[PDB]
Amino acid sequence: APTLTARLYSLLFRRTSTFALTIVVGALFFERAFDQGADAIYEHINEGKLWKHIKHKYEN
Amino acid sequence: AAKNVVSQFVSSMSASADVLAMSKIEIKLSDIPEGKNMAFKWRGKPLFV
Amino acid sequence: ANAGDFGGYYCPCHGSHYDASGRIRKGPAPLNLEVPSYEFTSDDMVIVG
Amino acid sequence: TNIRKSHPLMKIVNNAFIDLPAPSNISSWWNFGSLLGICLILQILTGLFLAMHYTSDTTTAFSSVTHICRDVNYGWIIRYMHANGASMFFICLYMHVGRGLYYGSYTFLETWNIGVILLLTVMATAFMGYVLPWGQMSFWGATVITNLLSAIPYIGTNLVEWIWGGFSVDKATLTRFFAFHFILPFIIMAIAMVHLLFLHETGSNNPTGISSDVDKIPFHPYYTIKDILGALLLILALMLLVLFAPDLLGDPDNYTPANPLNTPPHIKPEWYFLFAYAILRSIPNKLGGVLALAFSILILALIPLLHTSKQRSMMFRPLSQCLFWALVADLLTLTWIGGQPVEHPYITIGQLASVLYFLLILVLMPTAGTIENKLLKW
Amino acid sequence: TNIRKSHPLMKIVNNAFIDLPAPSNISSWWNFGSLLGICLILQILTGLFLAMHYTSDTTTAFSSVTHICRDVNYGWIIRYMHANGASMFFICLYMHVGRGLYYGSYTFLETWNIGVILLLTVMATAFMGYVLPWGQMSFWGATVITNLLSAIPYIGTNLVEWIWGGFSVDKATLTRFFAFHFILPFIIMAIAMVHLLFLHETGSNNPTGISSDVDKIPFHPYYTIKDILGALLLILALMLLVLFAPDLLGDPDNYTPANPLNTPPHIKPEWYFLFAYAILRSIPNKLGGVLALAFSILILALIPLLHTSKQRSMMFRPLSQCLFWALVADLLTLTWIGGQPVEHPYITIGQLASVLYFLLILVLMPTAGTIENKLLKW
Amino acid sequence: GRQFGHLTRVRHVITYSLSPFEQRAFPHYFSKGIPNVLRRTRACILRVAPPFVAFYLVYTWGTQEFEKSKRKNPA
Amino acid sequence: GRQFGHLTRVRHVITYSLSPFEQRAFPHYFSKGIPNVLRRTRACILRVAPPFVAFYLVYTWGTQEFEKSKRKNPA
Amino acid sequence: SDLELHPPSYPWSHRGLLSSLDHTSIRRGFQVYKQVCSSCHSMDYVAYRHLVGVCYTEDEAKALAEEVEVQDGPNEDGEMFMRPGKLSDYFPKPYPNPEAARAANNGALPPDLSYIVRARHGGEDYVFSLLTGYCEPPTGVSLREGLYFNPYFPGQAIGMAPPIYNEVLEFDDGTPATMSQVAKDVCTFLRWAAEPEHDHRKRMGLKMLLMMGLLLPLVYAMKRHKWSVLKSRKLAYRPPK
Amino acid sequence: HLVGVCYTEDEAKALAEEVEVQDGPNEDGEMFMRPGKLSDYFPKPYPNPEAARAANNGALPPDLSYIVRARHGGEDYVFSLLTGYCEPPTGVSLRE
Amino acid sequence: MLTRFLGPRYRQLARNWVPTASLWGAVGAVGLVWATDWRLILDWVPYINGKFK
Ligand code: HEM
Ligand code: HEM
Ligand code: HEM
Ligand code: HEM
Ligand code: HEM
Ligand SMILES: C[C@@]1(c2ccc(F)cc2F)OC(=O)N(Nc2ccccc2)C1=O
Ligand SMILES: C[C@@]1(c2ccc(F)cc2F)OC(=O)N(Nc2ccccc2)C1=O
């Protein structure tokens, strides 16, 4: 009943210290989530990569 | 974006695929007599048998 | 090879004395000389890698 | 007192990038200066990381470039960032010069005249670099450009053989070119600082060509954030080239190793040299052609003396606007003719476009400014 | 008004080299700054002309240096001007630092602290260059110095392999070193301008260590002609080296091509690194030795905090004078021990000289300044 | 080098400004924006466009002519 | 950057100077010169010289000792 | 001579902006290189380790290198011996010189095939059209018959005989080895040989566009925020009387 | 290199003419042997370092282009090496 | 000579800046961990286990 922007400001954005801490924690979690999605999008587009490699491995 | 460019420029200075390749060396053991240290070229930098 | 006060190895650069196991005994060096990964298939030939 | 204001080093940064009084009203077209600076640092960084792996012998020059692109970790992005960065550099150079022309920014005599030197220096830089991978176009491009000097009466042959280090483009030539190509962007960086010094005497011109002392804003935050946005648009355009079309502006003959015995049938410059190339081969004479080519770039140093209008900018000048856009389209035509064989329609139209280039600048635009003055009872 | 005074470019030259208020009484010892600048431009010019012919592959690096000295017209003078210019650079560096130490010129905090950076940057420069001809000393010198980084806890191995581009000093290492060696003197040139900027805030110190505002003379003609004479004395000393003793400071093992499988029995630095080399091998520990070596150069940044005297200069300070000359002679001793095998008298005296170096600076000279204060009732 | 306080003389001008936190970054972005770009296009078309069309016509003629020149029909 | 006119306050000092064209470049060059260098040498010798002699003595001992250490006489 | 025909646009699995190479089609195309082309064509810039990522396993590529003898530099006599073949070694060279290439092929030099896609206008489209486009000469046109008719080659007289209707190759998965399909696989492989970075380039390309789609509107919103102060400013002129 | 120094142009051409070289190929792709010119370098006794070691019972004879500048003493060392061969003293046995 | 900075005002100024100095320490540590992809710490963060095997 106060806003989420208001809470994100009050708790995190007011101090430049916590603002910087938010971005760096933000960047680590973003790098994981962005790479995981952007691989999976590229993977779904393509399907002749080493999707095939069940054929030739495990025989070894 | 900055992490990714910087890492890529950093990685370019790392050992290229060129350099990482397996080498491996054959040594004839009977050609090394009792007492003796023989020095062979391996990986650029010497192997003592 | 075959030099120093231990009958293994002497490094002339700063005065490292190694024994016949390649183990450090005297002078500046922190560690015994590097043992590579090896196996014997015959007692005529050894592959190191 | 602030630290920012009176610290002897931070003083310089303050007066250039923070507290610098800037026109409120400078457009998009003023982004290209910072973008040229970005282009220079991009060429510096990628180029150093290429210099870490490139070797400059004829036997190994092509192979070392190949080694970058297969074997060196991310050598391909660095290589292509560099090749396409050179093109970005010329795109930004041309937009920047064109801004200067249209807006009367050339009235800053010293700033402009140094910009000409900056243009001739990046041209020499990018020529010598293109030679370096020792492809077919590298070699014959090296051959054609270096031979332009042989047209100079009496001393010409002695001059070219001196810059070869021999009787043709060879071993001595390539290594030379690596050394000169390394040094010249650091010289560029120093001349770019001198350029910026001369500019700070007056500050910026604006779209209106009217003094903006009445309405200055601080460079920071306004043009710091405007320049950031500009840089991210440069990164988009560069990365589109590297990650989607890396060979689009490259000649395929440069993927064949240099052959000293056989030319390509075609032979064409990179896109940014095609207007000047069209101007050279328009003249059926050796000396005439090169003199025309030299004069096609060096004319920019005469543009201050041919200003004739009582207004600085072309904003309030419809006649000059039509003639300016006629120049741009003439230059587009010359870039088209540059990239085509010396055959039937292309010869005569290449001649006509070459005449019109020199007619617009030397005659037509200074006549438009005078007519426009007379029209305004001035 | 003069042109010289208010032209935006000539302004800078005026305030640095013409109208600059200078102490009437600055000696010979103040010549070394201009001489360091001369040394930098000498290294730039000869180095570029070497870069025109040198190739940076392991197969061809030695051969290309040989090619310079037999086949390239006057390649031998350029090569030897360069090698001996590097030595001249270090002779001038050491005289200049020593002047600073004795005369309390280090009280200019920012000027001094940039000079330290200048020293670490020329050291890195001259190391990477010496590698380039790919002799035996080039290689094993490359091996010893690069391995100093492997002593760093946890990250050390990863750091050295990164700067190698591989498991030893190899193909990747040499080409790297050519690129870094080309770029760094231009970075030096920029830091040298920043050095001179910080200095011009105060002007020069003098022999007396007393403010000379009461007795300033214009830089021109006085120090323009004094610096000319200084330069001609530098040219004499350089040319004596190149034209009469070109191999005097060179190691003969560098005339044998690099062997990766066999060290030289001796292994010694160039003369200017021999004190630091003596300090490193004084410690029977890996990390201890390198930390001692690093601290032997980096101590100069602590010399401002250990000033204890109420007088700036050592001119009126006989105790400090005796201890300063004791440092110089300790450094001579350390350069002697540096150049000798790790055997009986040389080990213990090398240890004692190493202790005394750190004892003079950290303890003995700041005790002398305090005693001298007490003696003058101050 | 020019500095604030030393630029020029201005008398009798009031400027009113709002904080960026008080106000819209994109105020009437399409509803006022696209009328403005349309007005800007109209203002400049007659100066910009006619040289480029004249290039295009010389381009399309020149390519067509050259293509058609590289053919016989009697010998 | 420091400039003449802005350095410091000086009162009551007269300087007399001659033109270089009126005067000698090397006035009493040996007859006054060598007495001065002799006086300068005396003033500094006791500070400069004794560290270097102490190096020389450690040099000559150290070289002699090492040379003589690299010999046997019984086995 | 003089007159030219230019290649059509074939819809490769790798044409579109985010479209990777078919690596199964890379696998088959190597086999075309090994079986057919390598007897006449050098591929000086691909080694056996390059295949390991792409179209084979580590064990497979070791075994393929094992098929050829190399020459290694000497032991103690100073000798040059022949060697069973490794992974570090490059694809094997048919000829010691360019002149030896010309001597075998009646004066014509077969060009290196490492960069041949990137070294011709049209890329793979040209190579496909060269391979599948061999026909009879028209009336008026006689050759040497040392030289052969191709309408896609400039000048029309190619020194390469059709290498292609020959129905070759061990096939493993075992697709039909038609002239069309053998050309499709070889061109897919020759793209890879010219451009090993192709797949990484486009993955990066997507990642760029997605990031730029975020970052461009956001930086724009930042510049709009700061510039708001100016873009909504009101002026009034209030002179005396 | 000899032409400036110790011979005439004609003399040095004739001295090069004494040895056969190997030149790079004609049209067959061949490698032929050649009467010898002035551009050619002094002739090499061995194709490898290992071939040098094989002839000289394990020892490698070093290249002699820089050998004066590559040893302390210079010419004095080389002269003393050449004119200073003697019998071993008692205590000292070699391989021979 | 650095006795200057010892007294109740300077202790209070230390106390005021300490949550900030430690929060900046938190920025730096998480920043270094992120930029090097650091092994020891990032195996222990319960999402971001994108090595696995
Ligand atoms: C195997 C299917 C194969 C391919 C693929 C191929 C490619 C090819 C190209 C792209 C050219 C270049 C043409 C050009 O210059 O634009 C070309 C050239 C020649 N080749 Fe080839 N080649 C294939 C295999 C073979 C085989 C098996 C032989 C021997 C019968 C052969 C020979 C040649 C020759 C000769 C040329 C040079 C032609 C010329 O310029 O006159 N190739 N190859
Ligand atoms: C090495 C490439 C160059 C760099 C780095 C560069 C740098 C810049 C910078 C930062 C600006 C200020 C911002 C702006 O107006 O864009 C600028 C302005 C200027 N530049 Fe350049 N420049 C270069 C090339 C040129 C060239 C080739 C010329 C034309 C011959 C030119 C002439 C000018 C002029 C006249 C201005 C004043 C513009 C005005 O205020 O309207 N510069 N330069
Ligand atoms: C001092 C920084 C620079 C260094 C050290 C440098 C070094 C290099 C090297 C090593 C190459 C050869 C490798 C290659 O071709 O990919 C190269 C080529 C190139 N250089 Fe630079 N460069 C620098 C800046 C410049 C600048 C300012 C320009 C002009 C915009 C430029 C234009 C290019 C071009 C066009 C090529 C050819 C690229 C190609 O097509 O392969 N470079 N340079
Ligand atoms: C890249 C090599 C360097 C150059 C080109 C150089 C440049 C110079 C110049 C031109 C002067 C003025 C004239 C003079 O007093 O000599 C000077 C003064 C000074 N330099 Fe350097 N310098 C360099 C190295 C250093 C080093 C290594 C240090 C010591 C860490 C040093 C510290 C200073 C100081 C303190 C002065 C003030 C001297 C005084 O007025 O008494 N500089 N520098
Ligand atoms: C940016 C200007 C410079 C360039 C382009 C350059 C380039 C060169 C090149 C090509 C070599 C290899 C050829 C040779 O060994 O003779 C060389 C070696 C050398 N460089 Fe530089 N150099 C530069 C300035 C420097 C500076 C400032 C120093 C430090 C005083 C330095 C120290 C040396 C040394 C010690 C060697 C080894 C000389 C030898 O014994 O052969 N150079 N450099
Ligand atoms: C990149 C290029 C170039 C750059 C800048 C310049 F001012 C002139 C040039 F020719 O260098 C080069 O060799 N070519 N190629 C070329 C030059 C003359 C005839 C044909 C090709 C260029 O376009
Ligand atoms: C020239 C030299 C050098 C120059 C500056 C420096 F700060 C350190 C150095 F080692 O580079 C090099 O490889 N050696 N040689 C050397 C280094 C360590 C052990 C033995 C020789 C140098 O003296």
mmCIF file of C-alpha atoms in Angstrom, chain E residues 19 21 200-202 213-214 216-218 318 321 325-326 328-329 333 336 343-346 349, chain G residues 1-4 7-10 46-48 51-52 55 58-59 61-63 65-66 69-70:
data_model
loop_
_atom_site.group_PDB
_atom_site.id
_atom_site.type_symbol
_atom_site.label_atom_id
_atom_site.label_comp_id
_atom_site.label_asym_id
_atom_site.label_seq_id
_atom_site.Cartn_x
_atom_site.Cartn_y
_atom_site.Cartn_z
ATOM 1 C CA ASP E 19 60.003 32.887 -19.672
ATOM 2 C CA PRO E 21 61.519 31.762 -13.738
ATOM 3 C CA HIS E 200 55.896 24.161 -12.881
ATOM 4 C CA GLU E 201 53.527 24.687 -9.894
ATOM 5 C CA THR E 202 56.627 25.352 -7.743
ATOM 6 C CA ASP E 213 62.045 33.753 -5.556
ATOM 7 C CA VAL E 214 64.403 36.638 -4.638
ATOM 8 C CA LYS E 216 65.123 34.055 -10.483
ATOM 9 C CA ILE E 217 66.456 34.309 -14.025
ATOM 10 C CA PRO E 218 64.611 33.510 -17.343
ATOM 11 C CA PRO E 318 77.885 17.135 7.025
ATOM 12 C CA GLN E 321 76.466 13.972 3.426
ATOM 13 C CA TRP E 325 77.975 8.943 0.116
ATOM 14 C CA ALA E 326 77.840 5.738 2.221
ATOM 15 C CA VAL E 328 76.195 5.545 -3.132
ATOM 16 C CA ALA E 329 79.231 3.366 -2.173
ATOM 17 C CA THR E 333 79.200 -2.574 -3.729
ATOM 18 C CA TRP E 336 79.790 -5.383 -7.851
ATOM 19 C CA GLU E 343 80.031 -18.125 -3.646
ATOM 20 C CA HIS E 344 82.046 -17.634 -0.458
ATOM 21 C CA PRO E 345 82.922 -13.921 0.415
ATOM 22 C CA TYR E 346 80.317 -12.530 -2.018
ATOM 23 C CA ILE E 349 78.998 -9.298 2.032
ATOM 24 C CA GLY G 1 52.965 28.368 -13.231
ATOM 25 C CA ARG G 2 55.058 31.191 -11.717
ATOM 26 C CA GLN G 3 55.699 34.557 -13.556
ATOM 27 C CA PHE G 4 58.002 37.554 -13.144
ATOM 28 C CA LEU G 7 57.196 36.014 -7.347
ATOM 29 C CA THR G 8 58.045 37.879 -4.106
ATOM 30 C CA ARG G 9 58.666 41.307 -2.458
ATOM 31 C CA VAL G 10 62.245 42.676 -2.592
ATOM 32 C CA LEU G 46 86.088 14.075 4.039
ATOM 33 C CA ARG G 47 82.379 13.542 3.221
ATOM 34 C CA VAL G 48 82.723 12.002 -0.308
ATOM 35 C CA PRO G 51 82.761 5.532 1.735
ATOM 36 C CA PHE G 52 84.479 4.820 -1.661
ATOM 37 C CA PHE G 55 84.198 0.021 -0.970
ATOM 38 C CA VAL G 58 86.075 -4.556 0.587
ATOM 39 C CA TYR G 59 86.498 -4.942 -3.257
ATOM 40 C CA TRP G 61 89.835 -8.136 0.022
ATOM 41 C CA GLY G 62 86.726 -9.844 -1.503
ATOM 42 C CA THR G 63 88.361 -10.534 -4.896
ATOM 43 C CA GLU G 65 89.702 -14.101 -0.781
ATOM 44 C CA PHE G 66 87.493 -15.694 -3.520
ATOM 45 C CA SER G 69 89.258 -19.991 -1.775
ATOM 46 C CA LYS G 70 89.216 -21.757 -5.218
#
